[PDB]
Each structure stands twice: as C-alpha cells, then as structure tokens.
Amino acid sequence: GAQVSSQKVGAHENSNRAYGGSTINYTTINYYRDSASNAASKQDFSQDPSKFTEPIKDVLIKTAPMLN
Amino acid sequence: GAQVSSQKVGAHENSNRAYGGSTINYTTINYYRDSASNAASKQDFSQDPSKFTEPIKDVLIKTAPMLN
Amino acid sequence: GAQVSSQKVGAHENSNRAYGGSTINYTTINYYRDSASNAASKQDFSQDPSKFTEPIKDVLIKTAPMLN
Amino acid sequence: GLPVMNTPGSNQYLTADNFQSPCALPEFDVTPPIDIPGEVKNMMELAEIDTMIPFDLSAT
Amino acid sequence: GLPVMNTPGSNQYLTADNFQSPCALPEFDVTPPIDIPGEVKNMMELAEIDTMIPFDLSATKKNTMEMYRVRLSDKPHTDDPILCLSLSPASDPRLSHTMLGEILNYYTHWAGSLKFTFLFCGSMMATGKLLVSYAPPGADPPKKRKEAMLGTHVIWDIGLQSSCTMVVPWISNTTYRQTIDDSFTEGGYISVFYQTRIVVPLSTPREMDILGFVSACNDFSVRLLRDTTHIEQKA
Amino acid sequence: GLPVMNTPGSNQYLTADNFQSPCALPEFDVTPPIDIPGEVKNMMELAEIDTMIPFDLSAT
Amino acid sequence: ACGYSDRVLQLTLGNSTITTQEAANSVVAYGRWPEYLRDSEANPVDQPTEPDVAACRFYTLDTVSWTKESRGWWWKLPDALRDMGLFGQNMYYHYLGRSGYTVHVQCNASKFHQGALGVFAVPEMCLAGDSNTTTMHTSYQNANPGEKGGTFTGTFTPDNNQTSPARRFCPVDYLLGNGTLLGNAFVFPHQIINLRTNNCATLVLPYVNSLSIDSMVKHNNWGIAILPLAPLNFASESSPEIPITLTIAPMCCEFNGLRNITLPRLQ
Amino acid sequence: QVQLQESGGGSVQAGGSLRLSCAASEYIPSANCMRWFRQAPKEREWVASVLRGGYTWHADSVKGRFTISGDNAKTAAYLQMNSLKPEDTAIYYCAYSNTCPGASADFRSWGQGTQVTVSSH
Amino acid sequence: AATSRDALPNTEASGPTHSKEIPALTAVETGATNPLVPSDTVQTRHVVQHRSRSESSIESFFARGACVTIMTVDNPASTTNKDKLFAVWKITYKDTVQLRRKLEFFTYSRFDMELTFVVTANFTETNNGHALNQVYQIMYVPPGAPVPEKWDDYTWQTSSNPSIFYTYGTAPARISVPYVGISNAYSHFYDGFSKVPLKDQSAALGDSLYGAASLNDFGILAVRVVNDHNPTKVTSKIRVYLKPKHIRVWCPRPPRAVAYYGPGVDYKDGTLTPLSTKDLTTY
Amino acid sequence: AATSRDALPNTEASGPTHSKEIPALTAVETGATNPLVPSDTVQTRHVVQHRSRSESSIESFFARGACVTIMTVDNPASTTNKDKLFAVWKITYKDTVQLRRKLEFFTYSRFDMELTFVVTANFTETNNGHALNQVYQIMYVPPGAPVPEKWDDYTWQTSSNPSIFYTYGTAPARISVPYVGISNAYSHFYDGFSKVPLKDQSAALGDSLYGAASLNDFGILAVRVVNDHNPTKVTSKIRVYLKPKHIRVWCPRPPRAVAYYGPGVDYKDGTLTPLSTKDLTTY
Amino acid sequence: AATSRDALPNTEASGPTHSKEIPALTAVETGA
C-alpha cells in the first residue's frame, strides 16, 4: 500500500535519463494504525481570499464605482 | 504478504490529493512465525449488551409493562 | 515507485548467471518530498564544446584555410 | 547493507506502543479456547448494566 | 535480520523534519470538526487584507492613536511632501507593524506587487487633488513633486468615492527581496504630495486627516521561514 | 519492528558518499533557472580550449 | 434603471424595520450568513427551542455620545442583549444557546462635520485587565456590562489597590484593548463610518465558536468595538457632539436544556 | 528587582495555629511554583511546595498539620499552621520557582523571612 | 483544485486607457479591500509567473517544532531529609513566547501534535565519581489521575497512563498525539468564565478566572530519573518540543504587539511601546 | 543524447596524403581553437576507444564534501563573570581555500547543498572530573532573525528557525538545502556595488564595498552546548562540510593563481609569483 | 459486523406522546 507522489523539482541536475526531467517521484508508506502518527503530506490546497478581502453582500466589480 | 488496511482519520490536513481525503491506508507485514509475536490489530468487534442487560427468559419489549 | 537503472560494469566477476554479464541494475527509491533531499543521479549529459572552442560567426571547416 | 538513517524516537520505550517482538516459546502448543459463557467485548457493555447507588453517605 | 548500514544524520533531531512517530493514545475517539466560519488556508490570504499604516511615528505621536493620522490642511499649494516612506515592507518602521509587515517578519524573502490605499476623512465639503507616487530605487529620493511626478504615480481626485489605490508594481532586480534593510534588494520610495490643494468653504474644518492602508496583490509570495524579532522573552 | 542487522561501515562519514538526507527548508519556493549563456557540462570542455603557454620561465 | 443603490437599504426582521439612505453596502462576516444548527453538527439531544420572530428582531441599545475626547466603546454579544425582551428570557432559561446577529451602528452628522469610526466585530474578543499584580482577574460583573457597554482608554493605569482590587478591564485603544496594534484590526469583519460618505455600518455575523452550541451566560461569542479612526470635528467648534446608536438583531437563535431561570449576580 | 514579602509570623503556645502569607511586589510572569522553607541552627529545611493549583506537596514532619493553598491568579502563597509544636520554631521564608514541584535549597534570592516562636508550657 | 505549490497568476500585457472604468477609485468604508493588480493602474508587459505560495500554507507555516518548557531535577547530599526528586509540569504552551505568538494569529485550531524530547545532563560539584547511564520516565498524567507524591510511590507503575522510558544518549524521544480537544477545535482565546456567579450564592462561590476553561486543560507531564540514588549528583533537563501537524485554523487576528504577560491577554505597564521614532517626511 | 559515461570517439585509420586540404594551418586570431585529431596530421590505425569522461562531468567534479569553518566553544573557571559560551559563524564558503578555488572555475552556479557536521570534543586541564555526553544545537538563523545574546535567552527556543540537535558520539549530522539564491543562479563574482553614490548625498552615505551584495548573504549558524555548565571544562569543535549536489555552472574562468586574500579578488604583495624557474631549452 | 470504531446510533427526532405505551415504567426485580 505505497503512495507514490511527484516532487516539484527546483534545481535540476544535468540529467534526463534518471534525474531532472522525467518526473521525479517519491514513495510513502504509512506504518501505524493511527492517523495521528502519519507525517504531513504537504500536498495542500489554496483558496480565494474573498471571505476576508471582500466580505460585502453585493458583489464587487473593480472597474465600477464602489458606492453606487 | 502485506496487509493493507484503512485508518479512521480524525484531524484532516488541508489535503485531498495526498492526505486527508482519498482514504488513508496503512501497511502491516508480519515478520515472525508465531502468532504471539504479532502486534495487535485493534480491528475489533462489538456486541449487543443483552447477555448482561436483559438476561430474562421472555423477551423484553420496552413499551409494554415489565410484569404482565 | 522504484527507479531501476543500469550500472556500467568495470571489473567483471567470473559470472554470467548472476553478476558480470546479464546487465547489472541498481534500485533507487526517493524517501522525501523535497527534491533537494535526493541523492545525485550521476546520469549526466555531455555537450559539444563548440560554444567555447569555435565561437566564430562563420562556421569553421578544418580542412580549409581559416582566413579566406 | 541497505542504507538507513535513524529518526528521533529510536530506542525509546513507549508503554502504549504496538510493535512485533520475538517469541520466547516458539512452536508452543497453545490450548484452544472453549465457549465460556459471558464474554465481554467492550467496557461500555458493563456501563450499560444497572448498578445501585449509595445515595446516603452520611457519617454514620 | 536484513543487513543495513547507518548513514550520516542518523540519530539527529532536525526540527524541520517530517517523519512518522508512534501514537501515545491509540484508538482515541477524535472529535469531528464542524464548519466554523473563516478558515484560513494560507498566510498570504491575510497579507491581502488592507491594514492601516502608522505613518506618523513622531516622538509624541508614536504609540498612540495619532500615529495613524496623516494631517492635511487647506494651505496654499506647495511642492513639498506630505509623507515619505521607503518600500521596505518588513523593515521600515511604518510598514513593519502592519499585518503585511508582521507576516513578512516570519520570512526571509518577499516578492510581488503591493498596493497602498488612502482614505480621505475630511468633510463632504472639502475638495482636492493629491499625487501619490512610487519611485523605483537608484536615484535621489523624491523631495519635490517635480521628481515624484516622474515615477509611477496616481493623481487622486477627492469626491464621492472616498478612497484611492496606487499599485506599486513589482519592479526589482532580484527574483525576491530581503526582508530586512538591504541596499542590494532595496525597494524604492513612496510619497504623497498636493496636486492642487485642499479647498474648503466657510464654516468647515480647515484641517483633516487621511488614513493609509497596505496590502499584497494576487502575485505576492514569501519564502524561507524564519523567526521574528517582533517578540521576545527575557529570561 | 523489522529485524535488521548492522553491517560494517555503519555510522561512518565518507566524504564521497551519495545518500539522501532530510531537507532543512521544506516546501521552499525555489527560483527557476534562466537560460544564461555559456553553460558547461564537463570539465574536458575547458581542456579543449586553447590556452597560452608560459614557455620562457627564466629567472627574469 | 429603477435607481436601486448600495447606499439605500431596508432591513426587516420580526416586527422591526430599519431604513438607511447613506449606507456603504453591508458586510456578511466571513461570507457566512447565520444559520440554524444542522443535524450533522448537532450536539445536545433534546428538542431545541427556536423563538423565531419573538427574539429575531431589532433591539436598540442605549445611545452614546461622540465627542473630541471619546476614545472608543465596546460591547459583548450576547451580553449586551441580555435584558432584551424574549431574547433575554430565552437566554436565561436555557443552559445552552446559539445565535447570529445583524449589528447596525448608526451615526449621522452633516456635510460640514468630519470624522471616522471603525466598527469591528471580533470573535472571542478577550480584553486586557487592569492589574499588574494579577492576571485574568477581571470579575464577571465587570466583564459583562450589558447594554451600556464599556469604553477604551488612551492610557494604561494599573490598579494599585491590592486590598480591594477594582477587577476591571483597562482596554488601551491603540492596542485594541488586547495587546495588538489597532492598525491591524481590519482583519476582523468591519466597516468604517466616515462622515462624508456614510452614516451607518451593517455587519451580519454568523455564530462563531469552537462548539456547535455553548453557554450564553458564561461566554460571549462576539465583541463589538467602535473606535474613532479620525477624530470628530465640526466647523470651527471646540466641543462638537454627535450621538452613536446601536441596534442589534439576533438571528437563527436556538436554545437547549431548559430549566429554571438563571439569576446572575450582575453587580 | 523581584520582591517577595513574608507576613503573619508571631509567638504562640504549643497546639496553636498560625497563617503565614507571602506576596510578590508585582506580578511575576514565570514563577508559578511557590515554596516554604524554615531554619533554626545553621541548616535550611524545606516545608512545603505548591504549584498553581491544586497540586500540593508536604514534608515528613509538617504534613497533616500544615496546608498550603495560594491564589491561582495572584502570585502569592499561604501557609496554614495547625497543631503547632515547639519544634516548629523557626524563621519561615518564601521563594518562587518555575515548574519545580520538587524542593531544594537552591534559590537565587532570599526575601527576609518571618519568625515563628512556639511556646511549650 | 488550486494547490499550495501552484504558480501564481501571470501578469497580462496591458496598454493605455481612457475610460469610465475606474479601478483606482474605491471606498474602504464598505470594509472591502480593492482587488487591484498592476495592470489596473499602469501599463504592463506579459510575464509568465513562476513563484508559488508553497511555503506559506498553514501546514508549512507551523512546520517547525518549538520549545515549551525546561523541566529539572536535583540530588542533595545524602537523603538528609529529602526524597522529592521529580519534576511535574502542567502542560501548556503559554509558558514561552515564540510558539505562543505564532499560535495567536488565529482564534481556533485543530491539529495532531508531535512532541520531541531532548534530554541533557551534567555534574555539579567537582568529583572523581562516575554515574552510569540514566533512564528517564516521562509520564503523561491526564487530568484526574493520581499525581506522584513520592519519587517511589505507586503512581509510577503506570498501568494506564502512557509513559516513555528514555535511555540517555540515544536519539531524542518522540510521540504523536491526536487532536484531543473536548471541543470541535481548540480555542486559543476564550472570552468568558467557567462559572456563572449566581445572586443567591456567595461571591466567592461563583468566582472564576476570566478567559479560563477546561477547553485547554490537558493534564501534566511528570518526569523522573528511574535509576536509584547515586553518590555523585547529576542534574538533568528535558526540553519539550511541539510541532503542530495536520493543522487547520480559523478566524485571523492581529498578532501580539506588546510583551506577553501571563496566560491571558493582559499587558504590563512599561511594555506598551512597540513602535520607534520616525519622521513623517523622512524615508 | 550523449551521456557522460559514453565512450569517446574511435580513432579512424588514415593513410598518406598530398592535397590542398590544410588541417594543420590555422589562425588563432579568429579566437577559435583548431579542432584537430591525430588523423589530421599523422597516419593512424583504427582504434576502438573505450575511455569515457564520466569522472569529469560537473556533477562528479564537485562530488566531494569540503571543510568550511571551525567553530569553537569554551568554559571558564566558574562563571566568575562570563556566560557568553556560544559560537556564531557567518555562513560563507570564502573562509577556506580548497572549496573556494574549485568554485571559481565558473562565474555562476545553481545547486542543492548538503551539509554534514563532524563534532569533536576534549578536556583541557588534567582532572578527575567526568562530563556526561553532550547535546549540541546547531541553529540556522536566516538574515533578519534575532541573533542570540546570552547563552540562555529566548532566541534558542527556535519556533521557526531550523535547528539540529546533535548527540555526541553518533553519526555526524546532515541536512539538505535547496537552491536558495535570490537570483536565477548564485554569483561567484559580482563586478559592482550595493549602493550608487549620489551627487546630492554625502560620500559616506553612498559608500559600499566593491563586489559585495546580498546575492550571497545567507545568514548565520549559531551553535551551543545544550547541556548546562559542568565543573570540568570541555571544549568542542564543529567542522562543517559542504557538498554541492545537483549542480549546474556557467561561464568558465581561469583558476585562481596566487594566494587568496579576503572575500574579494584582491591579492597581497609577495604572493605574486606562482611560476618557478626553468630554462627555455631544457626538457 | 459492528466494529469497535463504528459510530454509535443516531438520535431520532421524536414528538409529544399520550398513550398506553409505558417505556418509563419498569420492574428491576426481573434482573433486567
């Protein structure tokens, strides 16, 4: 039950027959029954800041006048 | 001869492309011949408490009078 | 997610039913999420030295006179 | 040998751990269980049984 | 057992590691989460929120409500600045303590465009035109409208729409800048001047305040986590 | 745990080794490379370039 | 076309209606409109009481006065509405309660006045105390002023009477009364009442807490802080004054665990 | 600097009672474990130690008779001395700690103390 | 679908403008932040954006472990009179400042917690004596269980409390703990009391501390040296490091600006001036 | 497609010649190197070439780790007066010569960096005292963070700075770091200044060091002995080894020929004679 | 089939009642 994921490669070695190019993956196998024991996946999501930046009831259209 | 089982995930990381969501599993491989050496699976069953709570011969129907 | 690559065999053991002959391979499995953690693959490319050796605008044909 | 690296927690004894360990009596002929009445599977089963309360805890 | 060989780094404790470890409370019945409003997924979301700048850090105004108020008046037109500030979001005293600044203090490098928004707080009867400017670094810092006018700028006309935003575009040599005062990765200069002047009719307050706000744009990012100097525990 | 046995060479630091090691700055946003002119792939490329010889190494 | 505007609004809840001709739109905190407790998130098992229109209506608290020297004001929810009609009653009769709110702060002046008020709704607005000898010591009474609310101050004055400590908050304005810089408060759901622009602030707040339902008498979910970003000024007058009025309406409030009435020690 | 002040000492006959009090000049945002000590000849002795609340430890001499409380808010502690014995006669002290339920005569500063004289008959 | 490591939006080329569209003008009264990008106020070129916010995700922000307490031990002359050689610390992050401040940007959180223990020891008085490698017992005593009275009483048997026996000189000890809060999330701040003072009751009886609740009562860690008494005194310190993993956080807040003072939000006199001096018209 | 480990080109058999083709004659003025092979000037046989340049690829050239600094500690008599027992070193490769010279054959580079730490300790004054195994804290303080003032201040809590707690006697510590440059590549040389001196400013204000920029400001490593003070003094040394992995390099340069002198390209008087004596007509 | 980690039974909504069904009354003598 191995989990193979891809890495986001920053510095590339002069290789495209092993390293650098052909997508570098990494393996993860969980060893414990409790989820709390797992390492962090870091494969996280982002969201639109709107809930904090534009909490207004009537939608904001940037090109138009704020107050109308 | 690996045993892959699912974990019951409590706290979820902000992930659904690795962690949190898509069912997190864990691997177990037994290394010894004797069963006594195995770790506990914890994958246990529950049962109806009736053998202790309602050990009466004639079935108990809660809505009816106990003594009839 | 194992990476199996071939080795360039220098000294060969008196074997062709295990070692020496039938292409010797080696396995690599990446254990970390960050690419920076990976070992060096060493599977590198070479290039023509021309950018340094012959940086002239008009192509050099060795058999002909350099200045014409 | 396989290149390995020790992580923190190595060599510690957590009383709540759940690891495999070598058997001191290999191939022992264990005695099979019998169907003894009254097996308990969970502690809450015992909590569901009515028990008498000692309401009057006066000095005497 | 499987023949193994220990490599360097064995037994070390790197505080930034990410390994599995045994659970001290197995089979614990964890309480499920509820949909609480306001979940944050990334720190930059907080950086994108406008926060007020304490522009006037004078000896008497610092550490008081006054630090936030930039005072303008209906005096005759002048080419002298209303305020001057350095584009050092994590190190200039005026920027360092804003949400943006504070978040930046936990990182070593920052990058992306920023935006300053000014709110005029005078009477409805007061009018005026101001010039907000950003001059990339490398030349004399603008001290006159004449110079400020040459860099990136917005001429703000005071009216019904009470606020104005000037975007400071990401213009830098390096791909990321230092989160400290550094010449090599200096950011430039922000300044505000009177385009015309503030004009009020009679029976109106002749002096009033403007408030400034700073926030990151959608192209802003930070990197290299580090500890901040903004908090300490003595002994 | 998996029964293992340490072989010779365990714990040594060979300066010429090629092993994986934990990253001190996880999830760092690395700056991408640009096409800078003059990349070298091998040292021998430099050896193939003509260089001037200091033939006359007399005392003066 | 028909002339609908962000400035002109009408809010109707229960038997109450509020109109406004100078609004600056309105804020729905964290983009979440108030709602009742979902079955999937429920906790107490007994059938909850939902007063609806009996409690979900606009209640106007006592009006305060803004002058050149005002430092700011604060209130706690549901505390401020503790004595408001059926909402107050339902609150005291039950062990548990949850509620969202529509807070509408009102303050008009003239085209000749100037000033700006920051109206902030802070989840879990814990305020700092007044002692340099004891921490977390502000008493229940002082922590809960009800509809009158409290005030911010420009200077921290430590309570030195160790015989009979005052046990009250000493909230410093620029510190938002909790040791954080005011200039950052904008991270909380808020609006600004700038006299030249608008005469009111409207904040719709959802129920926010670490639990599905909690004790209302013990814990205040939200805190309303109003501070003058820009000070009051009128004509060339040295002592101008304009009133500020709050009207708050509970929304989607439900209560569990009915018993006899809680009679708190409020003084 | 940091100051602790003992009070409540006096002279009583055997079998009597007292209550010692120790308050800090100003609050200390670190010291949460308070202790009591005594001495008569040339050697200090640990009385009782009390952390925030309500874990309280005692000594094999003063237990059952002595009791320590202290506010979980104000950095101060109290010692209730019951069934007092002529052997208890000594100068009592107060000292803040960190997270030290245990006790050892190893404190940096030392206040002043408070004399407790126990009469016989 | 947008992942933390995805590249940010590219800058689109934009030319001159002359219209009724007014991106620059706004009104902060509404409580909204004007969502502008460079192209809204200046002419821009096309730029393929490569940077990402991968290092600023909540998970990555709290990826570092941090110190929380320094527990210590001590041996006297002989017994002389003393046998209370053991440290008991009330588990709370609010003891330091570094981790505490980071955990205050938000109002609530949920996270699995990883604890690592670094143990160091040393000699006191110069002596020719030699101690043998020590074993330590780190025992988690959840709220309720009996707290150790003597260094060698029953409590140390640990029939149900999780305990870690650490041998000195080995890799620092480490364990994981699930989200153990009694609520749906831990509350970094609690605006209220544990007790409602009732009118028909005494003030004393209805009294409690502002901002304190069992929401954060996690119990204690009791640590002792397992080895028996040695003739030569050895002092030991256990540093505890906490790393919040698999974390989620709610409701942003302004970060603490003045020095922390107690487990509450309170502030001390003389620490109220975080800003320095700088003229309004000086760069 | 040509890999580093591929065999070099074979030598082709070539016979006598008599023609207008003139491989031997060239003109170096053009700035080109004449690309000749043996067969161009002599008769050659056919040779199946087996040798490869596998060991001279850039990656393989910098495959060895190298020393950079020697950080040290020190304990006095008692405290007496001193409590500043901790080493702080400004991270820079330009402290030694060996690694530095190798990194100068090129103008720019990009590489993930692996650091290994070898720690050794010892006694000072002959004594019968015995110290217990030590734990060290190697803390990376990126440019900006607060630098430790006392050996036991807040800074050591490390809530965000990466830190390595090394136990003495175990395998040397090791970590990896991604390419962390603020530029597209690190600049081994920088022909310029950090500040432009302006005419309407004072010379002092516009002044800076030639060849210095934040391009190479990486911060510092602060190391301390975690264990408390011991009666017997122990001195410790941490050697840092850097191995550039996954490396790429640009723009070749002539290697340094005279002794290094400072972090710049400067040279010292009396070190300017790298060549020895040898007659023009002596083999 | 019920495992230890399975969720306990949900609470079903129930309204007022007025009937001959007597859940509240019992007799502990039976030993149940």
List keywords for this structure.
part of a larger assembly, 11 chains, A: little secondary structure, Rhinovirus 14, subunit 4, two-stranded antiparallel sheet, 2 strands, 6% helix, D: little secondary structure, 8% helix, flat, Capsid protein VP4 (chains A, B, C)
**What is the straight-line distance between the termini of chain A?**
59 Å
**CA-based gyration radius of chain D:** 24 Å
- Separation of termini of chain D? 74 Å
Taking the sheet with the most strands of chain A, its summary is: 2 strands, antiparallel
By secondary-structure content and strand pairing, the structural class of chain A works out as little secondary structure
Q: Please count the beta strands of chain A (DSSP E, at least 2 residues each).
A: 2
How do the strands line up in the largest sheet of chain A? 1-2
Oligomeric description of these chains: part of a larger assembly
Summing up helix and strand content along with how strands pair, one would put the structural category of chain D as little secondary structure
Fraction of residues in β-strands of chain A: 5-15%
Question: If helices are DSSP runs of H or I spanning 4 or more residues, what is the number of helices of chain D?
Answer: 1
User: Which percent bin holds the helix content of chain D?
Assistant: under 10%
Describe this structure in words.
By secondary structure, chain G is mostly beta strands. Chain G has helices spanning 85-93, 140-143; strands at residues 9-13, 16-20, 27-28, 59-60, 64-66, 73-77, 94-106, 113-123, 150-151, 190-194, 200-205, 222-234, 242-258. Chain G has a single domain (1-267), classed as Sandwich (Jelly Rolls), CATH 2.60.120.20. Chain G contains 2 helices and 13 strands. In chain G, the strands form 3 sheets. In chain G, strands 3, 4, 5, 7, 11 and 13 form a 6-stranded mixed β-sheet that branches. A 5-stranded antiparallel β-sheet of chain G has the order 9-6-12-8-10, with no helix packed on it. Chain G has a two-stranded antiparallel sheet with strand order 1-2. Chain I has a single domain (1-283), classed as Sandwich (Jelly Rolls), CATH 2.60.120. Chain I contains 3 helices and 10 strands; from the N terminus they run βαββαβββββαββ. The longest helix of chain I is centred in the middle third of the chain and has 5 residues, at 98-102. At the E-I interface, strand 3, helix 1, strand 6, strand 8 and strand 10 of E face strand 1, helix 1, helix 2, strand 4 and strand 7 of I. Strand 3 (39-40) of chain E pairs antiparallel with strand 10 of chain I.
How are the elements arranged and paired?
The structure is cut from a larger assembly and holds three copies of chain A (68 residues), three copies of chain D, one copy of chain G (267 residues), one copy of chain H (121 residues) and three copies of chain I.
Chain A (H helix, E strand, L loop, with lengths): L2 E4 L18 E4 L21 H4 L15
Chain D lengths: L1 E3 L8 E2 L28 H5 L13
Chain H lengths: L3 E4 L2 E4 L4 E7 L9 E6 L4 E7 L5 E2 L8 E3 L7 E6 L8 E7 L17 E6 L2
Parallel strand pairs in H: 2-10
Antiparallel strand pairs in H: 1-3, 3-8, 4-5, 4-9, 5-6, 7-8, 9-10
PDB class: virus/immune system
Keywords: poliovirus, nanobodies, VHH, neutralizing antibodies, VIRUS-IMMUNE SYSTEM complex
Entry title: Complex of poliovirus with VHH PVSS21E
